[PDB]
Coordinates of N, CA, C and O and ligand atoms in Angstrom, one line a residue:
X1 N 73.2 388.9 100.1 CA 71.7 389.4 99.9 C 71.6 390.8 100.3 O 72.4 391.3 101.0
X2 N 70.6 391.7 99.8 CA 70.1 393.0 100.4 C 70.4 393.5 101.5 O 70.6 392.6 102.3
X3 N 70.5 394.6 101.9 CA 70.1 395.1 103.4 C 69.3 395.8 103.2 O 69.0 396.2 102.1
X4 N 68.9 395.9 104.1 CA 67.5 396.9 104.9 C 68.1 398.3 104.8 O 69.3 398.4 105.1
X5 N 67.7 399.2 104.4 CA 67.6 400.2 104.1 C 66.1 401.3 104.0 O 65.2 401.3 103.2
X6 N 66.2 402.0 105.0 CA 64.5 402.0 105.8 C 63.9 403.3 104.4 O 64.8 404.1 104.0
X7 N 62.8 403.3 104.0 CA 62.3 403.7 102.8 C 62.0 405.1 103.8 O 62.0 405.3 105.0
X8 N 61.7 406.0 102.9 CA 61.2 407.5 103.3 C 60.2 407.6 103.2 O 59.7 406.9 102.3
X9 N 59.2 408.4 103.9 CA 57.8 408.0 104.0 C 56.9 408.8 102.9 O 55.7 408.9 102.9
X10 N 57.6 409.2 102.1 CA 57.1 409.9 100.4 C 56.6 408.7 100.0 O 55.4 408.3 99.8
X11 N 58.0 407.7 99.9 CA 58.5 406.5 98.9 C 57.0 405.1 99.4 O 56.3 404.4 98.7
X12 N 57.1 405.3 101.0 CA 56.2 404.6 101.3 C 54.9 405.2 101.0 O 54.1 404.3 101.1
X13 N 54.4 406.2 100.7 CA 53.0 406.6 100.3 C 52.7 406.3 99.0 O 51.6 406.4 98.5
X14 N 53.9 406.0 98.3 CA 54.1 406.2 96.7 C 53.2 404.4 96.3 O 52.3 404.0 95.6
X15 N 54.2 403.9 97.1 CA 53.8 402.7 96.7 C 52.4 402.1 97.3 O 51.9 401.2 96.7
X16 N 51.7 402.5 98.5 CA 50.1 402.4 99.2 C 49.5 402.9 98.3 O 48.5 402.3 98.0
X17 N 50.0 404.2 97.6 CA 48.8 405.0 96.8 C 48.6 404.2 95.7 O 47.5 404.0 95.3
X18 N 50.3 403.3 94.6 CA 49.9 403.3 93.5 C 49.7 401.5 94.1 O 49.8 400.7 93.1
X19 N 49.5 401.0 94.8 CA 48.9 399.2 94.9 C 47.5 399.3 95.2 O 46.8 398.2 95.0
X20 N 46.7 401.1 95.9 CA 45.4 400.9 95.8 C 44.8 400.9 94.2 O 43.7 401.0 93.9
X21 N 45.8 400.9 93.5 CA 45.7 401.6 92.2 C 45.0 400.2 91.4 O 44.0 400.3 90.6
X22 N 46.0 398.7 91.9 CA 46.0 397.7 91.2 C 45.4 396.5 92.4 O 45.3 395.4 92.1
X23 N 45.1 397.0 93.5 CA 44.9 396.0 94.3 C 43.7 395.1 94.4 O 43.6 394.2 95.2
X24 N 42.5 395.4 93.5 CA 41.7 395.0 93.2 C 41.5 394.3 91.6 O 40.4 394.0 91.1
X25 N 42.7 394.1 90.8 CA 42.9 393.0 90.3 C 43.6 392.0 90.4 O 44.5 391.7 89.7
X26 N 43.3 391.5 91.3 CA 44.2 390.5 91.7 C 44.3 389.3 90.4 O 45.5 389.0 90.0
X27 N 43.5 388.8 90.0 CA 43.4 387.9 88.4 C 44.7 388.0 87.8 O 45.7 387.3 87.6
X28 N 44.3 389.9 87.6 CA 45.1 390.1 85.9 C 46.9 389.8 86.7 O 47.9 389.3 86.2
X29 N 46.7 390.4 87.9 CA 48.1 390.5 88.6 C 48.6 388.9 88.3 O 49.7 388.5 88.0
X30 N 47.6 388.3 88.5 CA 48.7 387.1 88.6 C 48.5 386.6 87.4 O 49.5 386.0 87.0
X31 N 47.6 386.7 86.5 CA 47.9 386.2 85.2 C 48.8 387.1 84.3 O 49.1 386.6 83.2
X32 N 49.2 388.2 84.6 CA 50.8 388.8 84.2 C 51.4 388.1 84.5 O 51.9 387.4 83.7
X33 N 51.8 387.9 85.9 CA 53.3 386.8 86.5 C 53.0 385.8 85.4 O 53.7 386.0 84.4
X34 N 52.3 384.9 85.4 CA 52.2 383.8 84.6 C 52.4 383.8 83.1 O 52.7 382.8 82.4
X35 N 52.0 385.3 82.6 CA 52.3 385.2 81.3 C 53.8 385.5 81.4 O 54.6 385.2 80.4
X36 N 54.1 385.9 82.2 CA 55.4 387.0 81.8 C 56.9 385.3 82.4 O 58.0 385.1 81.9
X37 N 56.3 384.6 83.4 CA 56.9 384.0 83.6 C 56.4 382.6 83.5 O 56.6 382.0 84.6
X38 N 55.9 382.0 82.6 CA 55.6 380.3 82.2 C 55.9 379.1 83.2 O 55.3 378.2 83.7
X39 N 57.6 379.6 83.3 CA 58.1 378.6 84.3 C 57.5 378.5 85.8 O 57.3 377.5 86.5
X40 N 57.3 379.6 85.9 CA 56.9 379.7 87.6 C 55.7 379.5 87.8 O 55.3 379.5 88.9
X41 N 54.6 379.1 86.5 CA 53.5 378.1 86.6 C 53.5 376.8 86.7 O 52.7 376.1 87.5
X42 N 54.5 376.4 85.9 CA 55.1 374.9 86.6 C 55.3 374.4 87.9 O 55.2 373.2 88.2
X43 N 55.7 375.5 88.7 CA 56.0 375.3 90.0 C 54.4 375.1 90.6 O 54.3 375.1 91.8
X44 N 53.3 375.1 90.1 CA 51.8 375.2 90.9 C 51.1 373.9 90.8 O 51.0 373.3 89.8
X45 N 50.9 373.6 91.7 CA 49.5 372.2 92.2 C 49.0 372.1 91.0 O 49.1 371.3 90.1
X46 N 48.2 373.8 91.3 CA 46.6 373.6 90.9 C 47.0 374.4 88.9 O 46.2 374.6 88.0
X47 N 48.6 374.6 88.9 CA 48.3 375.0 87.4 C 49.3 374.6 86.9 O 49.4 375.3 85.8
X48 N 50.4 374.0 86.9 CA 50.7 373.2 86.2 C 50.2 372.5 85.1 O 49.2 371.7 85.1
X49 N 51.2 372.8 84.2 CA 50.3 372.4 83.3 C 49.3 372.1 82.5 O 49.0 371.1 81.9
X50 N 48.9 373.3 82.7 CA 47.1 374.0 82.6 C 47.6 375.2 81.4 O 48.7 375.7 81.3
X51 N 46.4 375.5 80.6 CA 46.5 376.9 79.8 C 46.3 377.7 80.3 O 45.3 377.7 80.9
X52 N 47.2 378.7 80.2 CA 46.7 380.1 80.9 C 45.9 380.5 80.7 O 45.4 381.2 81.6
X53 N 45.0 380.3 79.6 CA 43.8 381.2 79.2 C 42.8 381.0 79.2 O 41.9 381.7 78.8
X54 N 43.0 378.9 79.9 CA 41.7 378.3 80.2 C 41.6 378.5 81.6 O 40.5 378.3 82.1
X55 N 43.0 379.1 82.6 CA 42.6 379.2 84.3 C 42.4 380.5 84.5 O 42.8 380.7 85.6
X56 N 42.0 381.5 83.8 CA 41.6 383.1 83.9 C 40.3 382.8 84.0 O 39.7 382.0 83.2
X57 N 39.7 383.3 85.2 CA 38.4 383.5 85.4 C 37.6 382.2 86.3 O 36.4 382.3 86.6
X58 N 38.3 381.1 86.5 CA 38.0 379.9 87.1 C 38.7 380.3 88.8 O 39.7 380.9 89.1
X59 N 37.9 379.8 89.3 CA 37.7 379.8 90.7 C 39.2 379.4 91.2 O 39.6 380.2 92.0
X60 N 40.1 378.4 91.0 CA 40.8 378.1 92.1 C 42.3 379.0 91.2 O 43.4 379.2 91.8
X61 N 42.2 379.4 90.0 CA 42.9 380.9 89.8 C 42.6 382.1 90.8 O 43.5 382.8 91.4
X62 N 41.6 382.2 90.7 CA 40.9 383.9 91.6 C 41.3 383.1 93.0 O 41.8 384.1 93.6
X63 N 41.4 382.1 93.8 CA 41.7 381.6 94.6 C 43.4 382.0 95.5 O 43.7 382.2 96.7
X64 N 44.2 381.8 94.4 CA 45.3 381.9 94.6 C 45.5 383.5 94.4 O 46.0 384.2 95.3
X65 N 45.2 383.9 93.5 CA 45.5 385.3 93.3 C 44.7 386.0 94.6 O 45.2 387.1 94.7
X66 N 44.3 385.9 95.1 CA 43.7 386.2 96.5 C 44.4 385.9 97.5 O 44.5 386.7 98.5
X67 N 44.8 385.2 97.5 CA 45.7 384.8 98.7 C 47.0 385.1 98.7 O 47.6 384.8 99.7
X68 N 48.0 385.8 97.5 CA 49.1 386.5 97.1 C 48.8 387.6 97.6 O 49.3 387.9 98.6
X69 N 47.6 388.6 96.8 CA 47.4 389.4 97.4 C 47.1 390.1 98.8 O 47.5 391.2 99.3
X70 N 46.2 389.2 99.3 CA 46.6 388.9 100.8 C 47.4 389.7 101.4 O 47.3 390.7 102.1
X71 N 48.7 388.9 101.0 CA 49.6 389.1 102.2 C 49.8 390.6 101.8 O 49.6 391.5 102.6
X72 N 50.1 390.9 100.3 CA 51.0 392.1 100.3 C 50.0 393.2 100.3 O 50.3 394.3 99.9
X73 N 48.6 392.9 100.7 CA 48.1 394.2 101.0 C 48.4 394.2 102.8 O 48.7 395.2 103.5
X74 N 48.2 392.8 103.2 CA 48.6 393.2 104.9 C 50.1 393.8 104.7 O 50.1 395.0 104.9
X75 N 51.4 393.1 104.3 CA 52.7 394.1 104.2 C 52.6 395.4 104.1 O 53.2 396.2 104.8
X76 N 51.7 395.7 103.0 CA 51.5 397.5 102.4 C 51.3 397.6 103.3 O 52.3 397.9 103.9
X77 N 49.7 397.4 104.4 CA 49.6 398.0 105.4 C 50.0 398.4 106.7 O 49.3 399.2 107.4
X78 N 51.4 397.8 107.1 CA 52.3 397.3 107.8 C 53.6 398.2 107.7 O 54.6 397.9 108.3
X79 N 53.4 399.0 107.1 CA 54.9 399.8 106.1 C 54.3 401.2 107.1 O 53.2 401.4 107.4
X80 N 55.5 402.1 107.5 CA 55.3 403.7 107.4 C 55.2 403.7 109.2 O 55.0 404.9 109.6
X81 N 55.3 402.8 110.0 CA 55.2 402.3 111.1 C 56.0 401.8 112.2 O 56.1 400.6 112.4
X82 N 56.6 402.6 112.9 CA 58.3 401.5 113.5 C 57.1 400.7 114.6 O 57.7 399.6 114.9
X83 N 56.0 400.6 115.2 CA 55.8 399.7 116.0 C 55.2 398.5 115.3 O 55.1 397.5 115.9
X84 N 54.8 398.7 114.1 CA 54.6 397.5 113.2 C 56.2 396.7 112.4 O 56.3 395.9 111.5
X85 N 56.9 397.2 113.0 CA 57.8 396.2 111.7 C 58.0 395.2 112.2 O 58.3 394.4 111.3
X86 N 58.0 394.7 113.5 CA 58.8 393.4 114.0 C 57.6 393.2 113.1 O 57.9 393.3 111.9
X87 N 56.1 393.0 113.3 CA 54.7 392.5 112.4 C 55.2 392.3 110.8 O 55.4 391.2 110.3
X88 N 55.4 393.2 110.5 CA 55.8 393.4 108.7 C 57.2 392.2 108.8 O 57.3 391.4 107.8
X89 N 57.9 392.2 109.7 CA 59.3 391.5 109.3 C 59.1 389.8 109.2 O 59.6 388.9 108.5
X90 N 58.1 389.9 110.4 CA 57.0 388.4 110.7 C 56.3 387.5 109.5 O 56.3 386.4 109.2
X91 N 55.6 388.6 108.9 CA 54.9 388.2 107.9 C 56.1 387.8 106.7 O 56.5 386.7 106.4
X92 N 56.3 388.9 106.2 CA 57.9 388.2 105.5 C 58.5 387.5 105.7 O 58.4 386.7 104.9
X93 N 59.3 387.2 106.4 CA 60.1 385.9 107.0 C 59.1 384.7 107.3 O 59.7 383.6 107.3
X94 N 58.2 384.6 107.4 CA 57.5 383.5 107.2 C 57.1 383.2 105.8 O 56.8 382.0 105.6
X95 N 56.9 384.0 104.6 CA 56.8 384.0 103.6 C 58.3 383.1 102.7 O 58.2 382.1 102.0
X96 N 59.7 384.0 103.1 CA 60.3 383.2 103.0 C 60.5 381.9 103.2 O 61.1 381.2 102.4
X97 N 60.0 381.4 104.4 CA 60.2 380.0 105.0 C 59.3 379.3 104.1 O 59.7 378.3 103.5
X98 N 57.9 379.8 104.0 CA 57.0 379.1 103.1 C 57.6 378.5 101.5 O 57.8 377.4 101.0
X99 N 57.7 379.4 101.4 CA 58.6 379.3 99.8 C 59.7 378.3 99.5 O 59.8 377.6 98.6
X100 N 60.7 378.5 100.9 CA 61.9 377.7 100.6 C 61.5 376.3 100.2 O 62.1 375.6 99.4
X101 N 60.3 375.9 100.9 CA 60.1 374.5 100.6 C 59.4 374.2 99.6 O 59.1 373.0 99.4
X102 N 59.1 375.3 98.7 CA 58.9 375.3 97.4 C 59.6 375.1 96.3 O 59.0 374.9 95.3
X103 N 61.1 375.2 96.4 CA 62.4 375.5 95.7 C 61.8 377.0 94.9 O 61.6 377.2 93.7
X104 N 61.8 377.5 95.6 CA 61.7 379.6 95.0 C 62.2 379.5 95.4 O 62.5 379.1 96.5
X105 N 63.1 380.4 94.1 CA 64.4 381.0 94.6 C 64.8 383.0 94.7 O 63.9 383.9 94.9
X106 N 65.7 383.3 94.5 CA 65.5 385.0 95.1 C 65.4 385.3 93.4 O 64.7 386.3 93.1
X107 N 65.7 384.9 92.6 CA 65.3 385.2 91.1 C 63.9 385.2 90.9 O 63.4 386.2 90.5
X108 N 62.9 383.6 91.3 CA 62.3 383.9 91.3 C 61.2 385.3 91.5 O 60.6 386.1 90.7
X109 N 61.3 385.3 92.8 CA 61.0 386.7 93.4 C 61.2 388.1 92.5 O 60.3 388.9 92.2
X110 N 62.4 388.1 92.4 CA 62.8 389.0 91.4 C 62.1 389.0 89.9 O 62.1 390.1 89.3
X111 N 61.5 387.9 89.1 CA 60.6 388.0 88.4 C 59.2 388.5 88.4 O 58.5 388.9 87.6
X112 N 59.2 388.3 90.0 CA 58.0 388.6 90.3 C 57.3 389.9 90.9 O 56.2 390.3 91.3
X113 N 58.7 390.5 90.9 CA 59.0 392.2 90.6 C 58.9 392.6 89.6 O 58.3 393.7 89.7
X114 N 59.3 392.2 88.3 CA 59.8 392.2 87.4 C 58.2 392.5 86.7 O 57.8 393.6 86.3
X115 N 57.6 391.4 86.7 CA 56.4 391.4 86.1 C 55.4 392.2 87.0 O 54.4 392.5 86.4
X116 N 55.4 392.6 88.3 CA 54.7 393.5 89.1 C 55.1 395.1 88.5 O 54.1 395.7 88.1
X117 N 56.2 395.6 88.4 CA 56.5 396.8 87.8 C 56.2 396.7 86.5 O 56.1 397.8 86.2
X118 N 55.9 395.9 85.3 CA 55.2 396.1 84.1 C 53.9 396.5 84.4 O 53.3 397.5 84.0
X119 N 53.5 395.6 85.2 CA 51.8 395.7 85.8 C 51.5 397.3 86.2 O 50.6 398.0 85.7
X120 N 52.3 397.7 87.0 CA 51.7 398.8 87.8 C 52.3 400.1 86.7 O 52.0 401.1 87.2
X121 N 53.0 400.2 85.6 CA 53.7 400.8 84.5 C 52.4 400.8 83.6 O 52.1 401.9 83.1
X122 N 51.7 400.0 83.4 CA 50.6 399.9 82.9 C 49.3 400.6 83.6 O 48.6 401.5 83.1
X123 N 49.3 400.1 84.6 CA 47.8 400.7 84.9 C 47.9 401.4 86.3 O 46.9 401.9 86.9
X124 N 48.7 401.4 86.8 CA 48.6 402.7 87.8 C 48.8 404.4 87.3 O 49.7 404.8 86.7
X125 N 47.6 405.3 87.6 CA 48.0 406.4 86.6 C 48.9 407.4 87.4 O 48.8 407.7 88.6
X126 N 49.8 407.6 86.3 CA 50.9 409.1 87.0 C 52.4 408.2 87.4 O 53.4 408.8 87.8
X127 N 52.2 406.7 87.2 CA 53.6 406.3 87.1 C 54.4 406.7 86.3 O 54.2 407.0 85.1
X128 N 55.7 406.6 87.1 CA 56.9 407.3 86.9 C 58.1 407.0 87.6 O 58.3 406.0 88.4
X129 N 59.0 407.8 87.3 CA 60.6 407.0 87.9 C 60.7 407.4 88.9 O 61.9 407.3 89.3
X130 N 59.9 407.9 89.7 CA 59.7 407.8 91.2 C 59.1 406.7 91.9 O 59.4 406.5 93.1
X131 N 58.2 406.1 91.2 CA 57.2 405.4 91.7 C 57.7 404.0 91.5 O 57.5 403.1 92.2
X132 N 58.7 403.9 90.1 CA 59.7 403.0 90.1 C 60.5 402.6 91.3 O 60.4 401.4 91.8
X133 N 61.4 403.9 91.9 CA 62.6 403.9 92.4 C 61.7 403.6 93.8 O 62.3 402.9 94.6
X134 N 60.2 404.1 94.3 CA 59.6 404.0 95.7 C 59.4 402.2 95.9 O 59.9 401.7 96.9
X135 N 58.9 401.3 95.0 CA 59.2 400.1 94.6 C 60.2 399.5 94.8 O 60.3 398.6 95.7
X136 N 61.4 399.9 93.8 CA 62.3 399.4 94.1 C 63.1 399.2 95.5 O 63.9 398.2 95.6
X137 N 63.0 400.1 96.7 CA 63.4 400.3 98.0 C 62.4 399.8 98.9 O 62.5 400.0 100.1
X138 N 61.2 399.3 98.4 CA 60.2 398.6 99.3 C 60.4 396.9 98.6 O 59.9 395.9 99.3
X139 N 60.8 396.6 97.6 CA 61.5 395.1 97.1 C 62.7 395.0 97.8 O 62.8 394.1 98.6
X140 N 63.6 395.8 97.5 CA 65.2 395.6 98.8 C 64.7 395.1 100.0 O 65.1 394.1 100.6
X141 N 63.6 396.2 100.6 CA 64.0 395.5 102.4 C 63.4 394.3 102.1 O 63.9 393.2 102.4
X142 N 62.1 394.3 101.5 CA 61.6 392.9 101.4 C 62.6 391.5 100.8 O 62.1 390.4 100.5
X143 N 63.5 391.7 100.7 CA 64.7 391.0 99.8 C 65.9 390.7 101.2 O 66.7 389.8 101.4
X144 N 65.6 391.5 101.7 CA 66.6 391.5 103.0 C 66.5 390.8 103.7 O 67.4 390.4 104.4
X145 N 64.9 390.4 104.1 CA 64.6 389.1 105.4 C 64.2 388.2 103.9 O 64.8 387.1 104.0
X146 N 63.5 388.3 102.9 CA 63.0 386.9 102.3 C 64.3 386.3 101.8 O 64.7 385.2 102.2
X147 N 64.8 386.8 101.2 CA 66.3 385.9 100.8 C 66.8 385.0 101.8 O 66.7 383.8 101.5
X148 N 67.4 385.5 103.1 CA 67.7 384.5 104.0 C 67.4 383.8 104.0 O 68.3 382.9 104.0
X149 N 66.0 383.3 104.1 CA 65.1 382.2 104.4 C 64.8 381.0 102.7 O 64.0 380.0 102.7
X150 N 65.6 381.6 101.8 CA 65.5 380.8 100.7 C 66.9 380.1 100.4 O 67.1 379.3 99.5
Ligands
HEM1 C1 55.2 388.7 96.8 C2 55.3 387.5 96.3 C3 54.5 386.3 96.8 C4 53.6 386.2 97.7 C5 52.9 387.3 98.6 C6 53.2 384.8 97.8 C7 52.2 384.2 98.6 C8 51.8 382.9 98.6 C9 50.7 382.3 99.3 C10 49.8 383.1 100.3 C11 50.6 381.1 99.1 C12 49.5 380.1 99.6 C13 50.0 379.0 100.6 C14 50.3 379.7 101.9 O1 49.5 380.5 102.5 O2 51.5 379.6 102.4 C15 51.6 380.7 98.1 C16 51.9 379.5 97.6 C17 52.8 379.2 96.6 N1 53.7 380.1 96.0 FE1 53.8 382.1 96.4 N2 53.9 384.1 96.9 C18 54.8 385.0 96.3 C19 55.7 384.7 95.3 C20 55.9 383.5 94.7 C21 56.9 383.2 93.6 C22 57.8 384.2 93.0 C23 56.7 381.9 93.3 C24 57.5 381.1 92.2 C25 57.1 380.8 91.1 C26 55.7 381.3 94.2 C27 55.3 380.0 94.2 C28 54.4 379.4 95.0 C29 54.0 378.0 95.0 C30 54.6 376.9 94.1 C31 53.0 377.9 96.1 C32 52.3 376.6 96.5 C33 51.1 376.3 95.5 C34 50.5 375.0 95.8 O3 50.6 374.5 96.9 O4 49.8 374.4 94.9 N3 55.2 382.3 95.0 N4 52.4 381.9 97.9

């Protein structure tokens, strides 16, 4: 799995500036993952099963997409901090644990990168292969405690 590899605090501004960019769609965020990955709707309670384009805009969609984003606005805010990390490492590793008993796996996850960097490629303005590469080293550490725990 990953190591930790502590981000530069450019890389960390890069990624606070461009998630205030998208942090207030939470919906479209997660109806990207869903479009982009079908499967990993299967894995849901409340959407299994369901049309994507009949659970856009229905309450216990905006429900869940709130509560994803949640966490990773508390993580973003958790970042750029050495007396917040045991906090940041807290929150993640319990994330992992949550998940394992989901059968998510680190692919998953990695999809869910995957379809997050299309998202913010799209509508964060002034992205670029900086803003890429600031992402990508804020997914590694995050990769370094959540893997374990899957
Ligand atoms: C950064 C990425 C992710 C975050 C922040 C996140 C966060 C959460 C949160 C907050 C919950 C609600 C229950 C709880 O509070 O523990 C949840 C549930 C869930 N997550 Fe994630 N998640 C992420 C990625 C994924 C991925 C990649 C999958 C795989 C497809 C996934 C599948 C699930 C499932 C199946 C549930 C339970 C839904 C239910 O009980 O009906 N999550 N997640």
């Amino acid at each position: 799995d990953p190591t930790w590899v502590d981000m530069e605090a450019g890389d960390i501004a890069l990624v606070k500036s461009s998630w205030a960019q998208i942090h207030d769609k939470e919906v479209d965020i997660l109806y990207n993952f869903f479009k982009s990955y079908p499967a990993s709707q299967a894995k849901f309670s409340a959407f299994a099963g369901k049309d994507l384009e009949s659970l856009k805009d229905t309450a216990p969609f905006a429900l869940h997409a709130t509560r994803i984003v949640s966490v990773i606005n508390e993580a973003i805010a958790l970042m750029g901090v050495a007396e917040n990390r045991p906090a940041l490492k807290n929150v993640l590793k319990q994330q992992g644990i949550n998940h394992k008993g989901r059968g998510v796996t680190a692919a998953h996850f990695e999809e869910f990168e995957t379809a997050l960097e299309a998202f913010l490629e799209s509508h964060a303005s002034g992205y670029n292969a900086g803003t890429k590469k600031a992402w990508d080293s804020a997914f590694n550490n995050m990769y370094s405690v959540v893997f374990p725990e899957l």
